[PDB]
């Protein structure tokens, strides 16, 4: 009755406050499933009422409901938004699994994220991370794990995979017969990445790292995108799992791009200015090559690379002299 | 001489330059991995507090600002972008991004707190940009075009004594001092002694001294000491310190006793202190 009376009186602020009080007292005393659902409902109602504030009067003066130092939590919408997001994630996890349900019942945001990722509800984890400004690394890594699992997995895993894709949101329907569940999950991850993107280094890094859990040949589109953005990081991950030949191919391609041949695919703009060459990586590669010293083919490819690099450098010197003369 | 805490930078490439703060509680570091990292070294404990990635190319220099204006950190770069970071409640965010240059910005040096919050940016296009935060509004930009024929390598402001002056060294073999006259930055002096590219120039923070001292390291290796007894006269006298066989990179003066730290391509740091009679003598050799 109190709630109804306040909301009829358009006292949005007061109604919200009463619902917040309601929820707190509710939980404190009744901790049964029914009581917990009632608390969730109460918080939902509070949030909604506070959001009904007049556009003209875009100010909500909210005080801390100390009486379940009278604090004044000016939360606007941000803080209560966070609380309800937390409650809703608790609720969603409860449905999927029962024990983790009870665990969410009495836990925090990081804990929620952890359990959701384990269960496989990735989109919800993504959303929760964004609200509390937590980074998206966890969710991207979890997605990569599932993809690696499917790459080499049994039939039952494939079907369960199809299922959790419907729980998430596949953007479009593709008729390809060859795709199967695994490829559908790949596309889902890719789309989620494009939309919810932040620092590039972070997301690409974590995906590539998780992909190399037990080794994987990366696809050409991804390779090209990475080369156009962060070729240095692409080289470092190669050395992490000892892919020297691929590293050398990448180096040769980068040299070609710096020379104007397919520079677009490496993000090289070129009036000569930019010529950043990763010398340390080349050094480490040479060191790795000169340890075992057994494969004749490796030695041959090394020699070829070195000759080509020397040629490149002489041309660079000629161009140098020319441009210096020009400016002068 | 004594060894204190050795930091682990968790980096991926050669750290090109570093710089501590006013009170010695933090250390900024910049590498060729397009990343400026902030380290909180307090009571011998290496703690990475922030990682700032906003550049497209290598980061060359990092400069801390005076405490009164807050935790302001400038970072120049190859991508023609001068990014000014600022710490608010423990969080580092980009507040301003000056993109008005045609080539790599090589050096950033803040002005003495007395003058204001002025920052000078020397770039390889031969131009120096002076950014000025007036407290309210954005940043006023004063760009000195054609400062150096080939490019500008380093900038450093004079100790407040208020006539705003700063010294800049370029690849045209000339060390030039600049002075703000009538609100306009005008060329004041042209000091010529080097036979090759000037790599770094730093104005000594003269303490209790009528004389003004500037050090300049160069490609050929000759480190020169420029001294003017009277600021009015503006007559600068050079003095050869030592001709290093390998290219000297940068020079740095100590705040309290004016001890020059010289680094050459021989991966060693030689400390030089002027004696009472006048002759400069090396006091220690700290190699890598």
């Amino acid at each position: 009755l109190l709630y109804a009376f306040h909301i009829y009186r358009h006292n949005y602020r007061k109604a919200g406050s009463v619902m917040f009080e309601y929820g707190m007292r509710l939980g404190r005393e009744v901790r049964t499933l029914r009581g917990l659902q009632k608390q969730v409902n109460s918080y939902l109602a509070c949030l909604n009422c506070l959001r009904l504030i007049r556009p003209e009067y875009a100010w909500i003066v909210q005080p801390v409901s100390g009486a379940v130092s009278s604090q004044i939590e000016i939360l606007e919408l941000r803080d209560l938004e966070k609380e309800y997001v937390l409650a809703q994630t608790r609720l969603t996890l409860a449905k999927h699994n029962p024990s983790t349900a009870a665990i969410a019942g009495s836990s925090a945001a990081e804990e929620m994220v952890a359990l959701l990722v384990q269960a496989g509800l990735f989109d919800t984890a993504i959303s929760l991370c964004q609200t509390f400004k937590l980074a998206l690394t966890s969710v991207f890594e979890g997605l990569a794990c599932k993809c690696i699992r499917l790459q080499q997995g049994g039939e039952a895993a494939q079907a369960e995979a199809w299922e959790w894709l419907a729980a998430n949101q596949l953007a479009t329907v593709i008729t390809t017969k060859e795709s199967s569940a695994t490829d559908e999950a790949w596309r889902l991850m890719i789309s989620y990445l494009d939309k919810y993107e932040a620092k590039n280094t972070l997301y690409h890094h974590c995906i590539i790292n998780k992909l190399l859990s037990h080794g994987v040949p990366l696809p050409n589109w991804l390779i090209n995108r990475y080369k156009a953005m962060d070729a240095a990081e692409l080289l470092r991950l190669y050395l992490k799992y000892d892919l020297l030949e691929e590293a050398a191919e990448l180096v040769l391609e980068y040299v070609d791009a710096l020379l104007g041949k397919g520079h677009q695919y490496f993000g090289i703009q070129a009036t000569s200015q930019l010529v950043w060459f990763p010398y340390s990586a080349i050094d480490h590669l040479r060191q790795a090559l000169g340890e075992n010293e057994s494969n004749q083919h490796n030695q041959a490819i090394l020699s070829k690379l070195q000759r080509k690099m020397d040629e490149y450098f002489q041309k660079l010197k000629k161009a140098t002299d020319d441009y210096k003369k020009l400016v002068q | 001489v004594s060894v204190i805490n050795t930091v682990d930078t968790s980096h991926e490439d050669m750290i090109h330059d570093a710089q501590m703060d006013y009170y010695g509680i933090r250390l900024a570091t910049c590498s060729s991995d397009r990343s400026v990292k902030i380290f909180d070294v307090k009571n011998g404990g290496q703690i990475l507090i922030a990682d700032l990635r906003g550049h497209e190319g290598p980061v060359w220099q990092v400069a801390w600002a005076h405490p009164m204006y807050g935790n302001i950190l400038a970072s120049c770069s190859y991508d023609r972008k001068v990014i000014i970071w600022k710490e608010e409640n423990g969080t580092w965010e980009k507040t301003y991004e000056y993109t008005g240059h045609d080539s790599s910005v090589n050096s950033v040096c803040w002005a003495p707190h007395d003058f204001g919050l002025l920052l000078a940016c020397g770039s390889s296009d031969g131009a120096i940009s002076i950014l000025t935060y007036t407290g309210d509004g954005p940043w006023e930009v004063k760009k000195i075009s054609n400062a150096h024929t080939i490019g500008c390598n380093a900038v450093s402001w004079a100790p407040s004594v208020y006539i705003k002056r700063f010294v800049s060294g370029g690849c045209d073999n000339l060390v030039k001092i600049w002075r703000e006259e009538d609100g306009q930055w005008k060329e004041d002096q042209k000091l010529e002694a080097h036979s090759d590219w000037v790599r770094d120039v730093a104005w000594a923070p003269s303490i209790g001294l009528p004389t003004s001292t500037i050090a300049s390291c160069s490609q050929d290796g000759r480190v020169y000491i420029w001294t003017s007894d009277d600021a009015a006269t503006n007559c600068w006298t050079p003095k050869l310190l030592h001709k290093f066989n390998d290219v000297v990179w940068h020079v740095s003066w100590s705040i309290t006793a004016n001890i020059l730290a010289v680094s050459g391509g021989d991966n060693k740091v030689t400390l030089w202190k002027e004696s009472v009679d006048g002759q400069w003598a090396c006091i220690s050799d700290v190699n890598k």
């Binding site: 010197k317 | 690849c171 990179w249 940068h250 740095s252």
Partner: peptide, 30 residues
């Protein structure tokens, strides 16, 4: 670790004037 002593090819291209600065990045003086 930083390469022990490669001082020839990179030195010839270190005397280059197209980007002596970029070739002289390895330097440091704080």
């Amino acid at each position: 670790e930083l390469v022990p002593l490669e001082k020839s090819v990179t030195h010839g291209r270190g005397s280059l004037l197209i980007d002596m600065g970029l070739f002289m990045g390895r330097s440091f003086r704080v």
